[PDB]
Amino acid sequence: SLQDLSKQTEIPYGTVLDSAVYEHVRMKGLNPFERDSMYSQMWWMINRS
Amino acid sequence: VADRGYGIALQHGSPYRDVFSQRILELQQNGDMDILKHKWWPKNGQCDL
Amino acid sequence: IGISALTITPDRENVVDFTTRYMDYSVGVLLRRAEKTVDMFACLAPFDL
Amino acid sequence: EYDIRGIQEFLDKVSQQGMDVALQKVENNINKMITTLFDTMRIEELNRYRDTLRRAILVMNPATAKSFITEVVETNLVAFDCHWIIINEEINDVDVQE
């Protein structure tokens, strides 16, 4: 599952720059009022460097 | 953590705080607090924390 | 008329009037299968051939 | 598009009575307006800003109000208790139902 993807970090994952999915993850990850924290982890997989 | 910044009391109704804000901004820009922090929390102290 | 993998998003509903949707939008992830782990000589493999 | 000289005897008269009125323009790019909040404010400040939104007034055309509300309500900046007035001279019934 995407949860089981987001828990581990030994295989990295990402997406195409400026895509709708990219900005959607950026939006999800920064929002502290979000119910499901998973995106706030995945963003730190995608935002690296 | 949020909610909190440190502070110290002074006698009510004095001109002191009213004009200290910019002086604190000076002390921040000088890093004078950072010099005091290095003093009181030495980064290469007796032990690795 | 305009038609493609077009996604209803609120910022676009301000200038074009989408119909009712014909299918749901879903985010997914691609992976490579785990090959296979078992072979007939796995009991000899602790020594090189 | 709103010529802010309508709400200019209101922003006067109200401010005798000591209400804490605040303005804000609504951008042409609502999503990036919103995420520019989360990318640039303290968590100490968000928990105060979200206390203001509980009581708000929208002064704008309905096709923007539908796209603003749907963006606020979906990102959870408003709970089950807010009260937003929505004033205009012309809302047709198909938008009263939307």
Swiss-Prot record, chain D:
Highest taxon of the lineage: Eukaryota
Entry's localization field: Postsynaptic cell membrane
Record remark: domains: The PDZ-binding motif mediates interaction with GOPC.
Family (UniProt): Belongs to the glutamate-gated ion channel (TC 1.A.10.1) family. GRID2 subfamily.
Related illness: Spinocerebellar ataxia, autosomal recessive, 18: A form of spinocerebellar ataxia, a clinically and genetically heterogeneous group of cerebellar disorders. Patients show progressive incoordination of gait and often poor coordination of hands, speech and eye movements, due to degeneration of the cerebellum with variable involvement of the brainstem and spinal cord. SCAR18 features include progressive cerebellar atrophy, delayed psychomotor development, severely impaired gait, ocular movement abnormalities, and intellectual disability.
Quaternary structure note: Tetramer; dimer of dimers. Interacts with EML2, MAGI2 (via PDZ domains) and AP4M1. Interacts with BECN1, GOPC, GRID2IP, SHANK1 and SHANK2. Interacts with CBLN2, but not with CBLN4. Interacts with CBLN1 (via C1q domain); the interaction is CBLN1-NRX1 complex formation-dependent; CBLN1-binding is calcium-independent; CBLN1 hexamers anchor GRID2 N-terminal domain dimers to monomeric NRXN1 isoform beta; promotes synaptogenesis and mediates the D-Serine-dependent long term depression signals and AMPA receptor endocytosis.
Function, in words: Member of the ionotropic glutamate receptor family, which plays a crucial role in synaptic organization and signal transduction in the central nervous system. Although it shares structural features with ionotropic glutamate receptors, does not bind glutamate as a primary ligand. Promotes synaptogenesis and mediates the D-Serine-dependent long term depression signals and AMPA receptor endocytosis of cerebellar parallel fiber-Purkinje cell (PF-PC) synapses through the NRX1B-CBLN1-GRID2 triad complex.
Protein name: Glutamate receptor ionotropic, delta-2
Organism: Homo sapiens
Source taxonomy: Eukaryota, Metazoa, Chordata, Craniata, Vertebrata
Residue window of the full protein shown: 175 to 272 of 1007
